[PDB]
Write an enzyme that holds these catalytic residues in place. Structure first.
Site, PDB file in Angstrom:
ATOM      1  N   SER A 146       0.930  -1.063   0.042  1.00 31.02           N
ATOM      2  CA  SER A 146       0.078  -0.061  -0.036  1.00 31.02           C
ATOM      3  C   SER A 146       0.841   1.212  -0.062  1.00 31.02           C
ATOM      4  CB  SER A 146      -1.025  -0.018   1.115  1.00 31.02           C
ATOM      5  OG  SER A 146      -2.122   0.874   0.916  1.00 31.02           O
ATOM      6  N   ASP A 250      -7.676  -2.767  -7.660  1.00 30.77           N
ATOM      7  CA  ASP A 250      -7.426  -2.588  -6.117  1.00 30.77           C
ATOM      8  C   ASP A 250      -8.509  -1.554  -5.634  1.00 30.77           C
ATOM      9  OD1 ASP A 250      -5.954  -0.387  -4.470  1.00 30.77           O
ATOM     10  OD2 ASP A 250      -4.694  -2.318  -4.375  1.00 30.77           O
ATOM     11  N   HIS A 295      -6.873  -5.934  -2.038  1.00 27.53           N
ATOM     12  CA  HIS A 295      -6.034  -4.725  -1.417  1.00 27.53           C
ATOM     13  C   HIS A 295      -4.838  -5.552  -0.575  1.00 27.53           C
ATOM     14  CE1 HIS A 295      -4.075  -0.876  -0.657  1.00 27.53           C
ATOM     15  NE2 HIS A 295      -4.465  -1.291   0.614  1.00 27.53           N
TER      16      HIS A 295
HETATM   17  F1  7SQ Z   1      -4.182   5.976  -5.294  1.00 31.47           F
HETATM   18  C1  7SQ Z   1      -3.676   7.003  -4.784  1.00 31.47           C
HETATM   19  F2  7SQ Z   1      -4.610   7.576  -4.025  1.00 31.47           F
HETATM   20  F3  7SQ Z   1      -2.934   7.866  -5.617  1.00 31.47           F
HETATM   21  C2  7SQ Z   1      -2.450   6.755  -3.864  1.00 31.47           C
HETATM   22  C3  7SQ Z   1      -3.031   6.105  -2.528  1.00 31.47           C
HETATM   23  C4  7SQ Z   1      -2.062   5.909  -1.551  1.00 31.47           C
HETATM   24  N1  7SQ Z   1      -2.367   4.854  -0.607  1.00 31.47           N
HETATM   25  C5  7SQ Z   1      -3.596   4.191  -0.403  1.00 31.47           C
HETATM   26  C6  7SQ Z   1      -3.289   3.596   0.818  1.00 31.47           C
HETATM   27  N2  7SQ Z   1      -2.166   3.833   1.209  1.00 31.47           N
HETATM   28  N3  7SQ Z   1      -1.462   4.374   0.552  1.00 31.47           N
HETATM   29  C7  7SQ Z   1      -1.006   6.335  -1.440  1.00 31.47           C
HETATM   30  C8  7SQ Z   1      -0.315   7.005  -2.602  1.00 31.47           C
HETATM   31  C9  7SQ Z   1      -1.293   7.232  -3.817  1.00 31.47           C
HETATM   32 CL1  7SQ Z   1      -0.694   7.940  -4.979  1.00 31.47          CL
END
Ligand code: 7SQ
Ligand code: NAG
Length: 351
Positions: A146, A250, A295
């Site tokens: 994640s 995801d 996920h």
């Molecule tokens: F999809 C997003 F939102 F872009 C993304 C999601 C996360 N995330 C989700 C759960 N933990 N970290 C971190 C960076 C980014 Cl870039």
């Protein structure tokens, strides 16, 4: 509870609230493989939403309540029945207590209520482990899930540069990024809850004093470094070998896309998301991308069960290891599902 906590001896390297950061370690005396795993857990990007996180997710912002031990699971397990890939490795779990996707380099001060030190935590863990046996390693695999998977992409080349500059050019640094390969796509429908990730990351980088890999920084330049948080943009700039694990559907991607009988508009949206993800992996030679709505995978105890084209993830990782000694017979490393709907792969997690 096989991994033991060590707080960092350099207490200037801290979690959000100024408490010392740290790592959990289980050594394997007969091994020159080292697995350093970066925990995930979203992020925060301004005072108000960091304050809310401090109220109800405090272990992601502070070490004051951490347990003295943790159990290693999945790829961090030391039992070959649970971890066919690297059960005999030296195991390190780095808790995520910086809320900065592992990118920050800012201390708590008269001008900053919180410290965002994720990138410095990684470098300080590596520094302190060199004295605990890492100096003898042959392979350092930086893994994460994640936000931790995105953290691998942001930090794997800096770990390689650090070891070279400290005098250890023979340690082979590799990355394993799980569930951190996101798309800056159009939302299905369009405050903290209303802020798209591109805008939230843009604000976060300023709040955290966030840092990104040098070649990616030089491409996108000032004000545009948020681009380097998106795997398909940062991956081509990296020099270290990186294995990418990503569910095609995801759940965190769907969440940021404001998706939750499915009618035509949403059907086409979901099918197009899967096609876009598959397209971004076309030129990633080491990847595992099943057609499931889920996920994270690599620290789950049943991580061995999912298969793409009849090959499990622990097998694909073993094939990757072999490839890093032209393709191997019956030992594939590029495994991307082609079917277009979640659970078209019968081995998907059941939930
Ligand atoms: F999809 C997003 F939102 F872009 C993304 C999601 C996360 N995330 C989700 C759960 N933990 N970290 C971190 C960076 C980014 Cl870039
Ligand atoms: C501690 O870490 C800080 C922050 O990364 C670094 O600047 C400094 O060299 C280290 N200091 C000590 C005393 O180890």
């Amino acid at each position: 509870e096989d991994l033991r906590l060590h707080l960092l001896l350099n207490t200037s390297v801290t979690c959000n609230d100024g408490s010392p950061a740290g790592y959990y370690l289980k050594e394997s005396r007969g091994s020159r493989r080292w697995l350093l795993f970066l925990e995930g857990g979203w992020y925060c990007f301004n005072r108000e939403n960091c304050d809310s996180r401090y109220d109800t997710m405090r272990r992601l912002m502070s070490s004051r309540d951490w347990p003295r031990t943790r159990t290693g699971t999945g790829i961090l397990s030391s039992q070959p029945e649970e971890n066919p890939y690297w059960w005999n490795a030296n195991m390190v779990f780095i808790p995520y207590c910086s809320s900065d996707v592992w990118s920050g380099a800012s201390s708590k001060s008269e001008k900053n209520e919180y410290a965002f030190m994720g990138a410095l935590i990684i470098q300080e863990v590596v520094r302190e482990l060199l004295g605990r046996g890492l100096s003898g390693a042959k392979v350092l695999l930086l893994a994460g899930s994640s936000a931790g998977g995105t953290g691998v992409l942001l930090n794997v080349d800096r770990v390689a540069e650090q070891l070279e500059k400290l005098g250890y050019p023979a340690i082979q640094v590799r990355g394993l990024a799980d569930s951190g390969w996101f798309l800056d796509n159009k939302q299905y429908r369009h405050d903290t809850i209303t802020c798209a990730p591109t805008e939230a990351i843009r604000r976060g980088i300023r709040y955290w004093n966030g840092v990104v890999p040098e070649r990616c920084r030089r491409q996108f330049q000032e004000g545009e470094e948020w681009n380097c948080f998106f795997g398909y943009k940062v991956y081509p700039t990296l020099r270290s070998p990186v294995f990418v694990v990503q569910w095609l559907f995801d759940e965190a991607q769907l969440t940021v896309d404001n998706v939750h009988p499915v009618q035509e508009g949403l059907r086409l949206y979901i099918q197009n998301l899967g096609r876009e993800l598959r397209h971004t992996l076309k030129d990633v030679p080491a990847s595992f991308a099943p057609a499931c709505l889920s996920h994270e995978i690599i620290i789950r105890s049943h991580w061995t069960d999912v298969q793409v084209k009849g090959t499990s993830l622990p097998r694909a990782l073993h094939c990757w290891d072999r490839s890093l000694h032209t393709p191997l017979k019956g030992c594939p490393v590029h495994l991307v599902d082609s079917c277009p709907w979640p659970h078209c792969n019968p081995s998907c997690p059941t939930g």
